[PDB]
């Protein structure tokens, strides 16, 4: 199998195995995608699959300013322009449907409320907010409140409506954001979950919310249009788990039963070392993948974090992964697919323009002649 040949992720046909990883860029004021956002995604539509920037299912699920959501009619319309443009260029795109949990600020929440989380443990994290006068500012994340059972039910309904909104906006499917210390991970990992009900304690209880989200989304749009992103060891957003292997092997054993389109795995610390660990034992990614396959899992296995041309080619041809998602390289190389096919040089990403601002460092990276 070649990185450059087509693949199938559930119901979604991919023209190649080069995936655009989800990338928050904070360029959608009012939580509504705009015409500049459409240019940005259309420039990258030769990707076998685009995963959008995280897109919240609700205002409660927002944690950063100027992030596009799926909870306004105007936002659905803005996304429809994007998916139509990507499709006209021959591409495929899934929405990364998001709930940040405790990684938020009161100024972003409905009613000025506390962010919600499995347990009321404040993150040592920072976010991007807008003041009353319209000025932007960095802020420490706010003190969260612990979710009630009824609150959890309401969030599940928000995942249902968000998945439905994604289909209405023309997406080929969704990627459930269950990575990088956000709400689902807060339930999964030990440092954030001190609950004493059916959603805390045991591995089965800590995985319960994740699997309820998956089953809610899959029932709404079809398991063949549902994928999920996982990040077993990442330290993102102040989260810690000492024993990820039994936890995550259990999670994917259960996901292997659900006929999902794809599993997207961050290998290591997100944006940092691939060999990162938090606990005493290194994580075994082969054992993790085998737990999924041995349970019947047939989703496309998409790997991320620190790949380059040679390692991506080797990982697919060896059968370790089915596809490779690139993040920073897609920021800087709209025609990454052609550059990799031809072994052409890549543009370097400009970190200062990753977040916020306008076209500079967003739509003005050049393609090849
Ligand atoms: C600017 C930026 C924004 C990101 N936004 C998201 C996001 O919205 N969702 C997500 O799951 N990961 C997000 N990530 C992580 C990337 O998807 C990816 O895992 C990371 O960049 C490592 O891959 P790479 O080595 O190919 O860059 C972001 C990373 C960067 C650099
Ligand atoms: C959605 C993100 C993630 O998953 O880490 C994110 C958010 C803000 C900046 C970078 C990344």
From TrEMBL:
Any one Gene Ontology cellular component term annotated for this protein: cytosol
Lineage: superkingdom: Bacteria
Native organism taxonomy: Bacteria, Pseudomonadati, Pseudomonadota, Alphaproteobacteria, Hyphomicrobiales
Pfam families reported for this sequence: Oxidored_FMN
Annotated family: Belongs to the NADH:flavin oxidoreductase/NADH oxidase family.
Keywords: Flavoprotein, FMN, Nucleotide-binding, Oxidoreductase
Signal peptide: none
Binding positions for FMN per the UniProt entry: 22, 24, 54, 96, 229, 304-306, 327-328
Classification via NCBIfam families: PRK10605.1
The protein's name in its UniProt record: GTN Reductase
InterPro entries: Aldolase_TIM (IPR013785), OxRdtase_FMN_N (IPR001155), Oye-like (IPR045247)
Needed cofactors: FMN
GO terms assigned for molecular function: FMN binding; oxidoreductase activity, acting on the CH-CH group of donors, NAD or NADP as acceptor
Domain NADH:flavin oxidoreductase/NADH oxidase N-terminal: from-to ranges: 2-347
